[PDB]
Design a protein around this motif. Structure first.
Motif, PDB file in Angstrom:
ATOM      1  N   UNK A   1       0.779  -1.224   0.000  1.00  0.00           N
ATOM      2  CA  UNK A   1       0.000   0.000   0.000  1.00  0.00           C
ATOM      3  C   UNK A   1       0.815   1.281   0.000  1.00  0.00           C
ATOM      4  N   UNK A   2       2.129   1.170   0.178  1.00  0.00           N
ATOM      5  CA  UNK A   2       2.989   2.352   0.201  1.00  0.00           C
ATOM      6  C   UNK A   2       3.839   2.555  -1.056  1.00  0.00           C
ATOM      7  N   UNK A   3       3.505   1.844  -2.128  1.00  0.00           N
ATOM      8  CA  UNK A   3       4.255   1.974  -3.366  1.00  0.00           C
ATOM      9  C   UNK A   3       5.619   1.304  -3.348  1.00  0.00           C
TER      10      UNK A   3
ATOM     11  N   UNK B   1      22.553   8.900  -0.743  1.00  0.00           N
ATOM     12  CA  UNK B   1      21.591   7.814  -0.933  1.00  0.00           C
ATOM     13  C   UNK B   1      20.183   8.163  -0.462  1.00  0.00           C
ATOM     14  N   UNK B   2      19.192   7.830  -1.280  1.00  0.00           N
ATOM     15  CA  UNK B   2      17.793   8.092  -0.953  1.00  0.00           C
ATOM     16  C   UNK B   2      16.922   7.020  -1.603  1.00  0.00           C
ATOM     17  N   UNK B   3      15.813   6.674  -0.951  1.00  0.00           N
ATOM     18  CA  UNK B   3      14.872   5.698  -1.505  1.00  0.00           C
ATOM     19  C   UNK B   3      13.810   6.504  -2.233  1.00  0.00           C
ATOM     20  N   UNK B   4      13.604   6.181  -3.506  1.00  0.00           N
ATOM     21  CA  UNK B   4      12.668   6.932  -4.341  1.00  0.00           C
ATOM     22  C   UNK B   4      11.504   6.144  -4.946  1.00  0.00           C
ATOM     23  N   UNK B   5      10.288   6.637  -4.731  1.00  0.00           N
ATOM     24  CA  UNK B   5       9.094   5.987  -5.270  1.00  0.00           C
ATOM     25  C   UNK B   5       9.145   5.972  -6.785  1.00  0.00           C
TER      26      UNK B   5
ATOM     27  N   UNK C   1      -0.311   3.862  -8.107  1.00  0.00           N
ATOM     28  CA  UNK C   1      -1.645   3.615  -7.579  1.00  0.00           C
ATOM     29  C   UNK C   1      -1.743   2.141  -7.199  1.00  0.00           C
ATOM     30  N   UNK C   2      -2.356   1.880  -6.052  1.00  0.00           N
ATOM     31  CA  UNK C   2      -2.498   0.521  -5.540  1.00  0.00           C
ATOM     32  C   UNK C   2      -3.573  -0.316  -6.232  1.00  0.00           C
TER      33      UNK C   2
ATOM     34  N   UNK D   1      -7.576   3.292 -13.860  1.00  0.00           N
ATOM     35  CA  UNK D   1      -6.201   3.321 -13.409  1.00  0.00           C
ATOM     36  C   UNK D   1      -5.753   1.890 -13.189  1.00  0.00           C
ATOM     37  N   UNK D   2      -4.761   1.471 -13.961  1.00  0.00           N
ATOM     38  CA  UNK D   2      -4.218   0.133 -13.840  1.00  0.00           C
ATOM     39  C   UNK D   2      -3.026   0.239 -12.899  1.00  0.00           C
ATOM     40  N   UNK D   3      -3.279  -0.005 -11.615  1.00  0.00           N
ATOM     41  CA  UNK D   3      -2.229   0.070 -10.613  1.00  0.00           C
ATOM     42  C   UNK D   3      -1.619  -1.271 -10.257  1.00  0.00           C
ATOM     43  N   UNK D   4      -1.011  -1.340  -9.074  1.00  0.00           N
ATOM     44  CA  UNK D   4      -0.348  -2.547  -8.581  1.00  0.00           C
ATOM     45  C   UNK D   4      -1.206  -3.805  -8.650  1.00  0.00           C
ATOM     46  N   UNK D   5      -2.503  -3.658  -8.411  1.00  0.00           N
ATOM     47  CA  UNK D   5      -3.403  -4.800  -8.468  1.00  0.00           C
ATOM     48  C   UNK D   5      -3.223  -5.471  -9.824  1.00  0.00           C
TER      49      UNK D   5
END
Length: 370
Positions: free
Chosen positions: A13-15, A28-32, A223-224, A317-321
């Motif tokens: 749920x957090x991408x 260093x950084x974590x990027x969506x 999008x989830x 929206x075709x998300x992670x699902x």
């Protein structure tokens, strides 16, 4: 490509986020990873939700563009200072490029308290970048300054800690099974596609294909849920309710508000239908379809699940699902998106997701919203 495998992480749920470095020395950084937007923006001030943030001051290669940017949302936003710096992806192609970077100095309802990412990497086109389309997106800069092919592919594997792969510059055969089919990128702003037909358990929803793309359909890793327009959502739900009528669920469930549970290992999968989406093909009158198992639209949280399908008012929206069941190839060079069954998708013992074709579908152009 092997060193890029499993280079994505995140929480359900957090991408999904990829590791990146910015500045000299490298920070260093974590990027969506977001195919639903086009800016590369990183927290650059100590917001309490952040594990870390970009510190321009400490980078010798940093160049201030002396210009601000403001990105508003439904009820929140983010704003910051524009500039450029040297950007690299530790678990991506072995290169370093100078890209635009939005240093976020103030924001609301943007960062997630508890997440492990501090920035966003918009992989869509300049058309929807901010302040305007003159601000070149990261990927465009990556392609122009190096010899990395103009394309990337995503294998989102989901489950809690989720994992995935972002292959930059190519396609990795080990990440998918079967054939790879392509749909045209209707226009280069969002990764817009055209859905020409929808079926539940093989049965057509019987709707003017336009309803499927009103007022646009996009592939969005940010999008989830699979988001469908009102009319489409209701029809889909009614059809899913009927198929699973063998049981009852509180309305709050079909709204993704209340979750349902079952004893560990006794989840009645057979009663939940498979959903088929037909996408415009590469050839005139030719289309293909992708099928989703209920394990895709019923995401975990004994065994409890939430309805991962919700209504939309801004198109499909075709998300992670959706994306988590498939290996998605964003073939920018050829304005097309490819789909193939993912080697990391979850599958039933009696049913199997798939990407197949060809099919004959006339007047597909009419399915697009104008």
């Amino acid at each position: 490509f092997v060193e890029m495998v499993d280079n994505l992480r995140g929480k359900s749920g957090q991408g999904y986020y990829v590791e990146m470095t910015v500045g000299s020395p490298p920070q260093t950084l974590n990027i969506l990873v977001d195919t639903g937007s086009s800016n590369f923006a990183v927290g650059a001030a100590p917001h309490p939700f952040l594990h870390r943030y970009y510190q321009r001051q400490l980078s010798s290669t940093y160049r201030d563009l002396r210009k601000g940017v403001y990105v508003p949302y439904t009820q929140g936003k983010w704003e910051g200072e524009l500039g450029t710096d040297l950007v690299s992806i530790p678990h991506g192609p072995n290169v370093t490029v100078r890209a635009n970077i939005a240093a976020i100095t103030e924001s609301d309802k943007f960062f997630i308290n508890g997440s492990n990412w501090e920035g966003i990497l918009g992989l869509a086109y300049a058309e929807i970048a901010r302040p305007d389309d003159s601000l070149e997106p990261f990927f465009d800069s990556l392609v122009k300054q190096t010899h990395v092919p103009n394309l990337f592919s995503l294998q989102l594997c989901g489950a809690a800690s989720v994992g995935g792969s972002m292959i930059i510059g190519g396609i990795d055969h080990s990440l998918y099974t079967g054939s790879l089919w392509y749909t045209p990128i209707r226009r280069e702003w969002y990764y817009e596609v055209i859905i020409v037909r929808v079926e539940i358990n093989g049965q057509d929803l019987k709707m003017d294909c336009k309803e499927y793309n009103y007022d646009k359909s996009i592939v969005d890793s940010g999008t989830t849920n699979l988001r469908l327009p009102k009319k489409v959502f209701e029809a889909a739900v009614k059809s899913i309710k009927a198929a699973s009528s063998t049981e009852k669920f509180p309305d709050g469930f079909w709204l993704g508000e209340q979750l349902v549970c079952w004893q560990a290992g006794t989840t009645p999968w057979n009663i939940f239908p498979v959903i088929s989406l037909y996408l415009m093909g590469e050839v005139t009158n030719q289309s293909f379809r992708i099928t989703i198992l209920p394990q895709q639209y019923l995401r975990p949280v004994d065994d409890c699940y939430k309805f991962a399908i919700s209504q939309s008012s801004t198109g499909t929206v075709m998300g992670a699902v959706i994306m988590e069941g498939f290996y998605v190839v964003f073939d920018r060079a050829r304005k097309r998106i490819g789909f193939a069954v993912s080697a990391c998708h979850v599958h039933d013992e009696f049913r199997t997701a798939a990407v197949e074709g060809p099919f004959v579908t006339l007047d597909m152009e009419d399915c697009g919203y104008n």
